């Protein structure tokens, strides 16, 4: 809420019109350029097959809830709604005795490889977003913290490969 | 003898269909695709006027970069980016002649002549020094859409361009014949490339500008080390797709 | 007779009493496999997808001179409401993949002149040249409304002002209609034919199409020699066409456009 | 662990770890077969309209009593905008049949309680029985804004005002809810389950609906048990669904409804 | 024993399951919905004071209509109505006792107990004359929505309602028992019957009588004759679908 | 679906897990660790003032020694050693500027991207004169930790780097092309070198500088003869041991 770079996104007892991130699939989207994913990927010019994107529910064992985790194809621009995120592929996550949810962004593309980087994006390196929305709110007994963290990792899934050896922008570390 | 070109094909006939004569064929296979573009032809020219050990920066001089974008189609500045991008046509160097040459780079005999909706093939680049004062460059090739990465230099008098896993070549000296020539395969993420007009746009609120495939080309050249070099380019294993018009011709 | 020639397609049907074949463009037809660059089980054999839309085109008369012509950008002409299920599924999907089989219509009599090329082209510019205006979503994938006039196509129409067209020769998007017959076509002449049908298979410079950016193939009608009649003589001449997608295919569910 | 229960369709997937099996009304499936009443071959087998289309339904509060209950008229409830390819698909159609597959989900703590009947039924009265106004096409197919008490539906609505409601002692509206456990269902106990999975096949008085006239089924949530919980527990409790059409069919393609 | 009501669905049990007992079952089955439903129950009431002889004109006395409907629902005339069709409610026949008769007809047995929601069957009529004066009566049967042709004689003193194809039945003289009683098919255009509600309308333009199916009925019964006569209805072969909830009854 | 991140690890999904999809894998191998660390990427560059027939003396120069520690990560003269160490650290080469370039040398490549903790290989190394002027220079190879034998000509006007049984290369005249290159063994007595920390010391009363391991390099690299040289590093055979986190890179 300050701005500062965390590992996770915050949940309660309510469920916001709007999503509680949004990630837009590019191995160059900023909110996983830290990512073994990504400081892999800058090192090839292309990838193609499956992002995985992991969530990982902290909150108390007390504590229940639904999550939509949805992927949109580009064309028609960002969900705006949940409505309009439910149009596309998506999972119901329910909170429970098992913690976390392996969902998987699916290859949908024009091209049989995309780009790793971009100057100016195009239909060749942008490919939609990664919406997690709440379905139902978190719910909980009394004595339980009302903010929920829910750890967010990616990689690449079972049929994601990289190629074309390169370097990347180079940058001064601070 | 009589037929109907509404069906959209006629026969192809020889003397013998209409009069007393024969066939006169004789076998012949330099018209096939692969060997027609299977030789260099101009392409391109770079010019450079910053040593080999300095920091690589985009530059321009009389319509000259000192790097180019890999594609036969015309490429130049586009409203002022950084490097050269695809162009959507073609300009007279001069504001005045009407004459050329002209401000764009190209592959002059493929303009010319593509017969073809799309293409398919690897590319070989010859890279020559204008004159003969001994050579003494550093160029870096960058595959089709990937980081540009002009960065600075890492460590003091050394090549920037040189600084990378990209694919690079370094030539100098006395013992060398001022060029540079190599293969690469083809790296676009487009399966084949469009070879005059994509009738679309490239990102996903159409601002991109129209007639431009995204990333349609064979990566880029960026090159330091004085002097002015001229390039080359020959379509290796070209396959060719959907047969389309040529350039007109004014009426003789 | 050997020219009643009928075509089914879903809940529609043309007839026609003086076809001279159906021409194959590359010997192909779109066969309906699902792209291979998609991950997500594609969405097809839409029997409510796979007919015939039939629009009315243009109003042929005398003062249209050879090579004036008519484009249709395709799917974009279809993507309309009266695109039917076709539309309302493609506008729902990042992708489609798709071939087309058309059927365009236009009737005189045997004391009228005159013929038409009928043809399918990829990559072909549907923008419009009557301005220096950059081509933008919504004017570069529309049916031409009026006959395009020839001559500025030759050698290209750069999106540039009047005086700098000066020191431009040539643009990407020229057309030398000289050779337009080097296109999968047909001619509509009409002491011969009514009707002229063609089928072209899926091209493209990828697997699949992101249609949204890009109107792959156009229908083009073209006259070849003018409009001709004698006074007495029916005046109004139009054509028409009968548009099917073949066997498309749809990836990327998500929610409509516009 | 063994209510840990993942369902595909299409592009889309519910997961619940809290099931309690999957309930087949009358034990029966939709199985797409086409209805011998159509001579023109249906569409069907339309991937993008087979998935599950979820939407928000209502909020739980402690004032809702036994049998305040919430309606879900189909295919209708789906007929707009969100019912994506089914819809579009749906409202080019003449005739439509289909079955449903459908989780409601509703999640409080295990320091709640209260209980929900979640159930399908057909010929479900689905007008609005609030006013003594003739139901129309545009209110009387429309999804529950609002908790419907439950005493004025015992023997019935007449559309007819309050001074002649008192001869009208019986309205074949009527719902006697003391039995409504007798449609195919399944319990919603905030104790057990977080999650309900119904599926009903297709019946109708006839082969295939002319769905414009008709809402042959309708999904309702009806609350058992009040919402209790005490002070510190959560106070926003929502129900949420997810709806299948089981492979739809449609007949008698046109231009589309509105 | 223990189980989970929130299945749907419960198991069937004998004391057996939780205590030392036996199974107890003796065979029967007049539960069977087809015997249950396969006996005449009073469905209706008719009522004429034209002559066999004469037009048929549709009339009503005191909520008796010379013609009815054949449905087990409630049925009357509904907005003035040239015939009686099927109602959505019940009325009380007088405006201040609200005590039953009721102005509208229906089989009450039917409308008290049908736990389904769709139904099929044969309908068996029997109509008897209320009172022991010997009968001279002609009814005339018309197929579900088939035209009711209500008529001019064509000939002099004959009773319009014989002059059709239609089945017909003409009682009369001292050896009669004033009475009569058929059977009839199926033969709406439904598939199947709404038993109790029908949740849609029945013409396109949506502007019908929500909860009233379109044809849903037996046909109807046009009489002509002296008298007032009950009519019952037998279900043949009946056939339903789909359980749901009875008529409430108030709380003891 | 569903899984637990604490194992430790959880599975590697493709879309046909939740989803109606396929695998969509195809062959590709250029993500090898052999193949994409088995290309020449700049790592060093040398500087020298010396004629080639003299006494080698080690000198800097503006941050630039006549001679290199082999070693992918920062060198540079440490606490005013007699040749280049590993360094701890990269600083900028300007005191003011804080931009680089570094005054430490290294495969900026390697630094940036090495995901392993430990590394084997053998090294094929590239020298390039920085102009053209024809060559004339002698370099000498020192393996890992042996004597640099910096020591005085034993004989008048010999390159005193090639009074040695060491491998050293000599290039001189107008038929070369300025640049020299060739391939050492890997030569430390470490099984395997420590590609970014050593969280250890060097010698036995744990005095040296934390965070070095004792001879972690290919060996040393001294030149005498007129020029500037930059250098590159190619690893052969090689082979990573041990994944562990890349450099940090700033958030957009």
């Known amino acids: 809420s300050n701005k500062k770079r965390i590992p996770y996104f915050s949940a309660t007892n309510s469920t916001p019109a709007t999503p509680l991130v949004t990630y837009q699939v590019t191995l160059s989207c900023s909110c996983m350029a830290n990512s073994m994913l990504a400081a892999v990927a800058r090192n090839f010019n292309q990838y193609r097959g499956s992002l995985n994107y992991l969530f990982v529910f902290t909150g108390s064992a007390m504590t229940k809830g639904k999550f939509l985790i949805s992927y949109t194809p580009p064309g028609a621009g960002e969900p705006k709604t949940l409505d309009q995120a439910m149009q596309a592929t998506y999972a119901i996550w329910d909170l429970g005795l098992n913690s976390s949810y392996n969902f998987t962004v699916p290859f949908i593309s024009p091209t049989h490889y995309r780009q790793t980087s971009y100057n100016t994006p195009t239909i060749t390196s942008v490919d939609g977003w990664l919406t997690v929305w709440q379905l139902t709110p978190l719910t909980y007994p009394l004595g339980v913290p009302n903010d929920s963290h829910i750890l967010t990792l990616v990689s690449g899934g079972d049929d994601f490969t990289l190629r074309m050896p390169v370097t990347f922008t180079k940058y001064v570390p601070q | ?252 | 007779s050997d020219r009643v020639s009928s075509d089914t397609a879903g809940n529609t049907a043309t007839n026609t009493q003086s076809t001279v074949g159906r021409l194959f463009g590359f010997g192909q037809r779109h066969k309906g496999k699902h792209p291979a660059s998609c991950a997500d089980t594609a969405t097809d054999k839409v029997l409510a997808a796979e007919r015939y839309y039939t629009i009315k085109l243009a109003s042929w008369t005398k003062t249209q001179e050879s090579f004036d012509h008519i484009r249709v950008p395709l799917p974009h002409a279809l993507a309309g409401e009266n695109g039917g299920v076709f539309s309302s599924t493609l506008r729902r999907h990042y992708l489609c993949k798709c071939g087309w089989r058309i059927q365009v219509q236009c009737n005189a009599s045997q004391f009228h002149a005159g013929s038409l090329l009928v043809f399918m082209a990829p990559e072909f510019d549907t923008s419009n040249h009557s301005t220096e205006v950059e081509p933008r979503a919504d004017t570069a994938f529309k049916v031409d409304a009026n006959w395009q006039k020839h001559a500025q196509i030759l050698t290209g129409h750069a999106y540039v002002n009047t005086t700098t067209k000066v020191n431009v020769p040539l643009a990407l998007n020229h057309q030398n209609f000289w050779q337009w017959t080097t296109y999968p076509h047909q001619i509509l002449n009409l002491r011969t034919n009514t009707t002229c049908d063609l089928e072209v298979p899926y091209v493209n410079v990828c697997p699949t199409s992101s249609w949204t950016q890009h109107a792959n193939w156009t229908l083009v009608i073209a006259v070849l020699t003018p409009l001709q009649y004698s006074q007495g003589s029916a005046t109004t001449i139009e054509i028409t066409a009968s548009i099917q997608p073949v066997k498309p295919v749809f990836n990327g569910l998500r929610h409509t456009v516009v």
């Open chain 2, 1 to 252: 003898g009589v037929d109907n070109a509404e069906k959209g094909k006629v026969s192809d006939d020889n003397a013998s269909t209409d009069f007393v004569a024969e066939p006169v064929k004789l076998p012949e296979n330099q018209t096939r695709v692969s060997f027609f573009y299977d030789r260099s032809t101009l392409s391109s020219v770079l010019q450079s006027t910053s040593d080999v050990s300095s920091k690589f920066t985009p530059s321009t001089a009389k319509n000259l970069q000192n790097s180019i974008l890999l594609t036969p189609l015309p490429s130049d500045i586009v409203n002022n980016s950084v490097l050269p991008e695809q162009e959507r046509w073609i300009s007279f160097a001069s504001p005045t002649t009407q004459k050329p040459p002209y401000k764009t780079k190209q592959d002059w005999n493929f303009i010319m002549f593509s017969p073809f909706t799309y293409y398919k093939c690897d590319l070989e680049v010859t890279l020559s020094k204008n004159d003969r004062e001994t050579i003494s460059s550093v160029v870096r090739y960058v595959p089709c859409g990937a980081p540009s990465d002009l960065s600075d230099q890492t460590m003091p008098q050394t090549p920037s361009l040189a600084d990378t896993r990209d694919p690079h070549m370094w030539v100098v000296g006395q013992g060398t014949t001022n060029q540079i020539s190599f293969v690469i395969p083809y790296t676009s993420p487009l399966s084949v490339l469009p070879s005059v007009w994509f009738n679309g746009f490239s990102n996903f609120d159409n601002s991109s500008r129209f007639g431009v495939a995204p990333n349609a080309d064979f990566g880029r050249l960026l090159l330091q080390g004085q002097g002015t070099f001229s390039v080359h380019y020959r379509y290796k294993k070209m396959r060719v797709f959907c047969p389309r018009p040529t350039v007109f011709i004014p009426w003789p």
